[PDB]
């Protein structure tokens, strides 16, 4: 609607905001909210023992779930910038941005790899 981009009013993440970041964050929140439910639906679907009609219904429900319920849709962005390439998980940062931070001394220990 007009007052918000997505259906649910989620907060903005602190520090660096970006449109893509915003999109990702919301998606992550929705996944967190509807994680157990999705799992339960999946279980019901992939069951040889259960009634077939019920499993079909569960599968249909899973199919009909939105873009923001999907775990696969989540993509690890850089947190300092808003890039989504070469994003290292141990400091949620992009390649160049990580290097910049590392040389400054923001990642406490990281340091030059001299051998």
């Amino acid at each position: 609607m007009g007052n918000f981009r997505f259906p649910i009013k989620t907060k903005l993440p602190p520090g660096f905001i970006n449109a893509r970041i915003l999109r990702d964050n919301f998606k992550r929140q929705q996944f967190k909210e509807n994680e157990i439910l999705v799992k339960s639906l999946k279980f019901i679907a992939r069951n040889m023992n259960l009634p077939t009609k019920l499993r079909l219904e569960a599968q249909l429900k899973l199919n009909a779930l939105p873009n923001y319920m999907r775990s696969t849709q989540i993509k690890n962005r850089c947190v300092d910038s808003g890039h989504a390439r070469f994003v290292l998980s141990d400091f949620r940062l992009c390649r160049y941005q990580f290097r910049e931070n590392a040389l400054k001394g923001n990642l406490p220990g990281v340091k030059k790899g001299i051998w």
């Binding site: 602190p14 520090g15 947190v79 141990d90 400091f91 949620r92 990642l107 406490p108």
Partner: protein, 50 residues
């Protein structure tokens, strides 16, 4: 837990910005004394942050 460590260092970085923002004052739109501050250093002992 490295996730927690990452979250802590993010927090610290965010606080630095906040501190920087605070550092500049105004006096009835007469004088704007810009106190310069260094980059903060955050000491995370088991008990306490400093």
């Amino acid at each position: 837990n490295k996730n927690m460590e990452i979250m802590n260092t993010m927090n610290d970085k965010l606080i630095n910005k906040l501190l920087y923002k605070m550092m500049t004052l105004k006096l009835n739109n007469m004088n704007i004394n810009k106190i310069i501050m260094s980059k903060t250093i955050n000491q995370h002992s088991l008990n306490k942050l400093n």
